[PDB]
């Protein structure tokens, strides 16, 4: 999309591998502000907003908290307390054309600065002189949107840059965006520290003859101790014998 009409995709109800982005060589700019980059695979957020647009090379520095420019004022404003990551990469081989690529626009004129995360797609004629400018364009009546001309022969700073702004926002609704839950190979018949779906403990994990119903995951005895469990990777039932202890 263009930056005056930037696209917004609501990433929710899924699990996000952020370290296929942070370990990607393609991205020229990867700036996480409120959050450490490597800690994204562990933190769980309620939802993510992906705001995608195309700007110039020299306007990438304005996609930042507290920065000020054309893009920050009239196209895309980030709050001062912004948590999230700004990702930008050069797209001169896609968004540039030999005969000009005038499909990408930006708002030049507005009566006031945008509030943070506000979108303004109105193309109405800008009253720049406060004459009776009754809709018709002309003198002191400007079209508010200017076009980025893009050629592939451009230098750096005039080339197109695709920007995706990930804003991880956490309302007190239940969080549904998490990282990949790492798993390791199952070891049986040994006294190991098991962590199965948040249920932790120490025990010997052996094969079990208890046939669970498919909705049930753990097993308890009379004394409310977890003695049976289901492996989440392969749906098999394991008995958790306590590790041997005894008087000497």
């Amino acid at each position: 999309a263009s930056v005056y009409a930037w696209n917004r995709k609501r990433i929710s109800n899924c699990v996000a591998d952020y370290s296929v982005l942070y370990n990607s060589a393609s991205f020229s700019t990867f700036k996480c502000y409120g959050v450490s980059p490597t800690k994204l695979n562990d933190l769980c957020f309620t939802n993510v907003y992906a705001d995608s647009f195309v700007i110039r090379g020299d306007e990438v520095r304005q996609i930042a908290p507290g920065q000020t420019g054309k893009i920050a004022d009239y196209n895309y404003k980030l709050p001062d307390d912004f948590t999230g990551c700004v990702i930008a990469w050069n797209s001169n081989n896609l968004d540039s054309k030999v005969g000009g690529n005038y499909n990408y626009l930006y708002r030049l004129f507005r009566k006031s600065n945008l509030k943070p995360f506000e979108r303004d797609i109105s193309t109405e004629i800008y009253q720049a002189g406060s004459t009776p400018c009754n809709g018709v364009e002309g003198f002191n009546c400007y079209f508010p949107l200017q076009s980025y001309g893009f050629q592939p022969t451009y230098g750096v700073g005039y080339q197109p840059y695709r920007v995706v702004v990930l804003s991880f926002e956490l309302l007190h609704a239940p969080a549904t965006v998490c990282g990949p839950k790492k798993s390791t190979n199952l070891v049986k018949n040994k006294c190991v520290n098991f962590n199965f779906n948040g249920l932790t403990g120490t025990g010997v994990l052996t094969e079990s003859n208890k046939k669970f119903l498919p909705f049930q995951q753990f097993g308890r005895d009379i004394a409310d101790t977890t003695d049976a469990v289901r492996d989440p990777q392969t749906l098999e039932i394991l008995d958790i014998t306590p590790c041997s202890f005894g008087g000497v």
């Epitope: 020299d58 000020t68 420019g69 004022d73 009239y74 030049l108 004129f109 507005r110 009566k111 006031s112 600065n113 800008y126 009253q127 720049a128 002189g129 406060s130 004459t131 002191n140 400007y142 200017q146 001309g149 050629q151 451009y154 230098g155 700073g157 005039y158």
Partner: antibody, heavy 117, light 108 residues
Framework: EVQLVESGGGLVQPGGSLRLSCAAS????????MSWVRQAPGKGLEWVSV???????YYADSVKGRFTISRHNSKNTLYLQMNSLRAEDTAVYYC???????????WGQGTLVTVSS | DVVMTQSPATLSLSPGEKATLSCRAS??????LAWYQQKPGQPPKLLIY???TRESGVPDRFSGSGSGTDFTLTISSLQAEDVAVYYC?????????FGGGTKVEIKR
């Protein structure tokens, strides 16, 4: 049909303050990009400052921290408050309406600021 | 900054011949250049913008060409009132810089 009439020039002491005014007639200063441009006597043009249509102000790096561009929106007036004026700030200053911070479509007649003892 | 260099420093031509004025940029501005005319005493007035397009009211003899580093303002037939200083402006980069000017005078 526009006119840009400027006022407020004269002598200041080196280190003094001076407030230049720019009245507009055929357009409104509140919703245009407005700029102050320096021209020293004998030397070419030099951009000093700009205020955006939404109110964002920018300055040249040789003049940052000393000048302040502002507007009065009620009857279309542009102000430049100048502080700590060096002896290299003697020049004719022009206020100009720009189409963005790009090209200056209409200019003011200019006001002469002389900085000497 | 972007240093903008005019050529020549002074141009003295007869009325009616081709006035070619070159302007060179320190780093490439794509089409982000304007040309202004300043008569003595008067403020500058915008002749062309976006390196080619004439501002309204400018005579047809003023025209412009060029891109990248080299730019050119051409007056096809000089008249008597074209004695002025002509400036080129870049505006692609964030510090708006002007050229040093070219003083065009007429022969007689």
């Amino acid at each position: 049909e526009v006119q840009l009439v400027e006022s407020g020039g004269g002598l200041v002491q080196p280190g003094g303050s001076l407030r230049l005014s720019c009245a507009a007639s055929g357009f409104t200063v509140s919703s245009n990009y407005m700029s102050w441009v320096r021209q020293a006597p004998g030397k070419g043009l030099e951009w000093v400052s700009v205020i955006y249509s939404g109110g964002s102000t920018y300055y040249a790096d040789s003049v940052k921290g000393r000048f302040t561009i502002s507007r009065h929106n009620s009857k279309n007036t542009l102000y430049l408050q100048m502080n700590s004026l060096r002896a290299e700030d003697t020049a004719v200053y022009y206020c100009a309406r720009g189409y963005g911070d790009y090209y200056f479509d209409y200019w003011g007649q200019g006001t002469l600021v002389t900085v000497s003892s | 900054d972007v240093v903008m260099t005019q050529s020549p420093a002074t141009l003295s031509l007869s009325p009616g011949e081709k006035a070619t004025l070159s302007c060179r940029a320190s780093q490439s501005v794509s089409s982000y250049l304007a040309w202004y005319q300043q008569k003595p005493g008067q403020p500058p007035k915008l002749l062309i913008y976006w390196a080619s397009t004439r501002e309204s009211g400018v005579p047809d003899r003023f025209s412009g060409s060029g891109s990248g580093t080299d730019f050119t303002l051409t007056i096809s037939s000089l008249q008597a009132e074209d004695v002025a200083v002509y400036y080129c402006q870049q505006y692609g980069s964030s510090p708006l810089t002007f050229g040093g000017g070219t003083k065009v005078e007429i022969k007689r």
